[PDB]
Write a protein that binds this ligand. Structure first.
Ligand SMILES: [Mg+2]
Ligand SMILES: [Mg+2]
Ligand SMILES: [Mg+2]
Ligand SMILES: [Mg+2]
Ligand SMILES: [Mg+2]
Ligand SMILES: [Mg+2]
Ligand SMILES: [Mg+2]
Ligand SMILES: [Mg+2]
Ligand SMILES: [Mg+2]
Ligand SMILES: [Mg+2]
Ligand SMILES: [Mg+2]
Ligand SMILES: [Mg+2]
Ligand SMILES: [Mg+2]
Ligand SMILES: [Mg+2]
Ligand SMILES: [Mg+2]
Ligand SMILES: [Mg+2]
Ligand SMILES: [Mg+2]
Ligand SMILES: [Mg+2]
Ligand SMILES: [Mg+2]
Lengths: 50, 16, 71, 75, 64
RNA sequence: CUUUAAUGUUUGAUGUUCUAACGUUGACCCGUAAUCCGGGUUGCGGACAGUGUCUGGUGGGUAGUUUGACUGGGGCGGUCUCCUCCUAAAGAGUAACGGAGGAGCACGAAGGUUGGCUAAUCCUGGUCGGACAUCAGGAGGUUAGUGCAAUGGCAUAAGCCAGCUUGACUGCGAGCGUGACGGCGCGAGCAGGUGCGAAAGCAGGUCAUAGUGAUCCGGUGGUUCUGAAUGGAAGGGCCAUC
RNA sequence: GAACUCGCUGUGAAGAUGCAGUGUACCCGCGGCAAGACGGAAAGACCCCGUGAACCUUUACUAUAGCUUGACACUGAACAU
RNA sequence: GUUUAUUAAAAACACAGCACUGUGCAAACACGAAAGUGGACGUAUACGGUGUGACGCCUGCCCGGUGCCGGAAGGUUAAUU
RNA sequence: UUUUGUAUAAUGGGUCAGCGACUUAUAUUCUGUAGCAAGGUUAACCGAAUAGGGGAGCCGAAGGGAAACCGAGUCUUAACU
């Protein structure tokens, strides 16, 4: 256990989201990555650990 | 097991 | 309530005008059918006037080549 | 305290020397790189060797290590 | 009397032009984060019923 | 409005009193030459008690059922899914309550790429400092290391550092491997967008093989695809996910 | 089931009147005895099995009669607070 | 004294006596969708249930568990609104 | 008959005669055969009744897609070598 499932939501206004896992105890900061958004068809910033 | 536990309390068939 | 009509059926209406009512009268579709579409199946060799029916691109060419009109 | 075993993984050589293969055909499934990739042969993430062109399978030993290499001679 | 259709089967199989049956792939309802995108992408399209299973499907769907 | 006192008051509660509902298995009268029943008169209770509908608790009093399989008989004990090795007879596969061990994760870096680098152990000398901390030289040669079992691998390192980063991308996929099937696995290349590098190039997670659960029924977001007279909506479908 | 129904040693679905080898034995009654015909009688009652049955138990599960709680109805009038 | 009519007559059951507990009479309790009936034409020196079992000497410690009896402050909690 | 395996001391039959177990209805698929053929065929019903009438229907001649929809194509995708 320990690792929790989170969602990475797109910052392009689309609802597209990626799913991953995170260790909340060790890393409390929010994961922020640049990923491809298929709706707008460009690489944008994806944020959130929820 | 061959024929135990009692049969007719001893008489075999009896009746029924 | 949707049906498809072959080019072969166009000549069976008896009248030259192909409508929803005329197709029903010729026992081609059915009383409850409300929408119909003519497709490229078979061939049409007689001028016919198709009214109020969707027609495929292929069927349109065939009907017009035979001398018909799609209203 | 015993009695446990895993499922067999069907590893091994699938196409032997001289066999005509099509691009993409798996030649050998292996755990480690017992056989290494040569000309027109690729190595997968699990070290599976596969053909990148049509032709015949060729086994050879090369190098100062005399290691085994599989190549596809385009025919 | 008339044969009755197995209703559950009728919601899972659809007959094709040459007489086969198409169906949706399993393993794409939940528990999806751990699955790879490649794996999930290949499960999305519809597939045909295998030869060994056709007999069972045909029995369940007499009016297909 | 500030801030509040009454009074009236939908009502609420509690107490007291009352009689007219209702109770009487108190007395008397009549039907009636009848310890049933009914009517009448009177006393005692009295809006309680009791009964209907709804509702929480209790309920072997009664009822319907369930209570696994393997197994050198059955029970007891052990076992049931997945990974590694041996048995396994030099392709694959191959049994037993045969012999031995592990897993039900971890990681936003422990992933990508560019540049660089190379162990264990021993000997000799050297402050504290000794069997072993740290430094210098030599021998040696991977006996070391690998996030975790075992096996196969690994120097062009797959092992160890540093810079920049998000390819742990989206749509697809020639062709193969392996399963009775459900499935699972490997994959060049193509389109879009991206990182690293001067560039050729490399990148669709991690040295590889365990780290997992069908369908149903629901939940959340997106999408008019559908929308039972019509316009909407509810519900359904499709895509992502729990 | 049908019989022209001996012993022994072996063999054999593993304890033979019937198979092999061998020994013995004229044909047929009557009175007696029970060693064998795995003798007769009852589709083993022990044991296991069947996703069999019935009764019984309980803090197994799900119900439920009964008992009990409140709300509303049958159900009204004063007055004080 | 009683008992497994038909393999068990006993150390089993009953018993006088003892104790606990319920019950104020339209009694508790039982049979009954109910009316009613038994208890009883009885009334706590009575009636029901449970356990023990003439008589003699006696019957110790534990109320945490489970049940029963009592308590009410608070917590939690149904229909309803 | 049942079995890996029965002269088996494994099951069943004292004997004879008579009776005694894969059927029927309606759907669906395949094969043979007959009619007609891009068509084939009617049901109830009517009827001088196995004729004739009745084409309501059903199956086939087009598929793809969850669907709107498109159509010898269509779905997938922003678009497909
Ligand atoms: Mg018609
Ligand atoms: Mg879904
Ligand atoms: Mg019971
Ligand atoms: Mg068992
Ligand atoms: Mg082998
Ligand atoms: Mg071999
Ligand atoms: Mg003898
Ligand atoms: Mg004699
Ligand atoms: Mg016998
Ligand atoms: Mg038996
Ligand atoms: Mg006596
Ligand atoms: Mg007796
Ligand atoms: Mg006796
Ligand atoms: Mg006693
Ligand atoms: Mg046997
Ligand atoms: Mg024999
Ligand atoms: Mg016999
Ligand atoms: Mg015999
Ligand atoms: Mg017999």
């Amino acid at each position: 256990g320990i690792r929790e499932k989170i969602k990475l939501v797109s910052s392009a206004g689309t609802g597209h989201f990626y799913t991953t896992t995170k260790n909340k105890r060790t890393k409390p900061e929010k994961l922020e990555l640049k990923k491809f958004d298929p709706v707008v068809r460009q690489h944008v910033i994806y944020k959130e650990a929820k | 097991x061959v024929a135990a536990x009692x049969y007719x309390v001893x008489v075999x068939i009896x009746x029924x | 309530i949707t049906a498809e009509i072959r080019l072969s059926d166009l000549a069976k209406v008896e009248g030259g005008v192909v409508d929803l009512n005329t197709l029903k009268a010729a026992n081609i579709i059915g009383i409850q059918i409300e929408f119909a579409k003519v497709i490229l199946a078979g061939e049409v060799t007689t001028p016919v006037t198709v009214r109020g029916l969707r027609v495929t691109k292929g069927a349109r060419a065939a009907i017009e080549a035979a001398g018909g009109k799609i209203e | 305290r015993n009695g446990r075993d895993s499922e067999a993984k069907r590893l091994g050589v699938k196409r032997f020397g001289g066999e005509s293969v099509l691009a993409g055909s798996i030649i050998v499934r292996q755990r480690g790189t017992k056989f290494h990739a040569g000309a027109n042969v690729g190595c997968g993430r699990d070290h599976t060797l596969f053909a990148k062109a049509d032709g015949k399978v060729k086994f050879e030993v090369k190098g100062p290590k005399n290691r085994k290499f599989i190549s596809i001679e385009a025919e | 009397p008339k044969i009755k259709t197995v209703r559950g089967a009728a919601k899972r199989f659809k007959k094709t032009g040459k007489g086969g049956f198409k169906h949706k792939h399993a393993n794409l309802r939940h528990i999806l984060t751990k699955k790879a995108t490649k794996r999930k992408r290949h499960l999305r399209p519809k597939a045909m019923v295998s030869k060994g299973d056709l007999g069972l499907v045909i029995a369940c769907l007499p009016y297909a």
